[PDB]
């Protein structure tokens, strides 16, 4: 019954502002301190801020002081984080946590599901799709690997299908890499019978909703 | 991190593992309580141990905490696949301005599957990318276990660091792991070498795939 429901995350350029919200139920909100914690993708937890139950005190990590404001609305059972002057290094999942206290230090007994803040100066860009053509030496037993390289898109996500979803067997679409440019690339590869390369057409279907772009790329054998 | 944890621990199902958390005289040494969180992959942290030793009622008896001097420890007995997660210790440091300090986290791997060597496929730059004045080598690595790999690139037997981007391993449907690595070249660099290699190391053993502009 203890619920902490976060919203407000999304993709913003550096120097812009975002407000995060943490809407609570299942306990008397006004009796509890609340924290914000963040986690950069692939990294550890970093405490961000606290607000007292009564709003008498607010404390901030040195990394955000002057830029972020924690606040609460007791009538809405809601915690906020106002984030101004966002930097790329603020990119993280932001968690709200209910304050608890033991004897000589505090801890967070319930946590929100998190909201992702992505701070990037990259602009919406549809992918370039290049064919990864199969070997003419038949390479890898009676089975050939062919694919699509989905280059330089922003933001996530892209979806890939083959032959309009009719080819699922031996498909592996790899998670994207994030380049120093701030753009993503990914690849999809399919393992097919070498004997099919003469008679069967292979088309990767790449969909990038954020840029309203779809690419259908025919992947033909080399010689 | 004010609090030092081992980056990684592993064990087989049924084994006991211990995760240490080392601080100093202004945190754990000062008597400030230590707490532990479990973070299952793709989920929010959850409270595992509070006030050094206490389990929330929802936590199984296999999880225990202890604290001595400047160190705390989390022990997990009867290891199960479900325990595979990142574990964080947390305290307070009187020499820092925040309410909480965290350890850097420990990735717990539960070795619940047999070893599996990686499948490696290396693609050269497409003639369309080259004809668009760019060049990407694509090294696709799949079906390996455990989910740790090193990917290194070579141009004619010499290592290449610049222009490389490699994903962290990601779990597949079959509970093995996949990763990918890209090498970005000028078409000039591509054409100016006899070969390029992707060299994938998994548990001390290496698969190397080579392509040639030829």
């Amino acid at each position: 019954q203890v619920q902490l429901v976060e919203s407000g995350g999304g993709v913003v350029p550096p120097g812009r502002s975002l407000r995060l919200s943490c809407a609570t139920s299942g306990f008397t909100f006004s009796s509890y301190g609340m924290h914000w914690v963040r986690q950069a993708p692939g990294k550890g937890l970093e405490w961000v801020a606290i607000i007292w139950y009564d709003g008498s005190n607010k404390f901030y990590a040195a990394s955000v002081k002057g830029r972020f404001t924690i606040s609460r609305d007791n009538s809405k059972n809601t915690l906020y984080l106002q984030m101004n002057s966002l930097r790329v290094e603020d990119t993280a999942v932001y968690y709200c946590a209910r304050a608890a206290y033991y004897d000589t230090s505090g801890y967070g007994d319930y946590w929100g599901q998190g909201t992702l803040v992505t701070v990037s100066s990259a602009s919406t860009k549809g992918p370039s799709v290049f064919p990864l053509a199969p070997s003419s030496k038949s390479t890898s037993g009676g089975t050939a690997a062919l694919g699509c390289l989905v280059k330089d898109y922003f933001p996530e996500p892209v979806t890939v299908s083959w032959n309009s979803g009719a080819l699922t067997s031996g498909v592996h679409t790899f998670p994207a890499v994030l380049q120093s440019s701030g753009l993503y690339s990914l690849s999809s590869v399919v393992t097919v019978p070498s004997s099919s390369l003469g008679t069967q057409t292979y088309i990767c279907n790449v969909n990038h909703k954020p840029s309203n772009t779809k690419v259908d790329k025919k992947v033909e054998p080399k010689s | 991190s004010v609090l030092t944890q081992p980056p990684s621990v592993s064990g087989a199902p049924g084994q006991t593992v211990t995760i240490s958390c080392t601080g100093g005289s202004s945190n754990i040494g000062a008597g400030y309580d230590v707490h532990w969180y479990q973070q299952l992959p793709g989920t929010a942290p959850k409270l595992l141990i509070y006030g050094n030793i206490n389990r929330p009622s929802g936590v199984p008896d296999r999880f225990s905490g202890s604290k001595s001097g400047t160190s705390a420890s989390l022990a997990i007995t009867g290891l199960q696949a479900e325990d595979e997660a990142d574990y964080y210790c947390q305290s307070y440091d009187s020499s820092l301005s925040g309410s909480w300090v965290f350890g850097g986290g420990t990735k717990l791997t539960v070795l619940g599957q047999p070893k599996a060597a990686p499948s490696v496929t290396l693609f050269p730059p497409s003639s369309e990318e080259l004809q668009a004045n760019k060049a990407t080598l694509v090294c696709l690595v799949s079906d390996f276990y455990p989910g740790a790999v090193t990917v290194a690139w070579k141009a004619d037997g010499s290592p290449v660091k610049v222009g490389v981007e490699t994903t962290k391993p990601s779990k597949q449907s079959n509970n093995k792991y996949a990763a990918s690595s890209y090498l970005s070249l000028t078409p000039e660099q591509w054409k100016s070498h006899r070969s390029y290699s992707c060299r994938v190391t998994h548990e001390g053993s290496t698969v190397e795939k080579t392509v040639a502009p030829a």
Partner: peptide
């Protein structure tokens, strides 16, 4: 202002 002080009503 102690950031380690109990921030709760109870």
């Amino acid at each position: 202002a102690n950031p380690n002080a109990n921030p709760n009503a109870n």
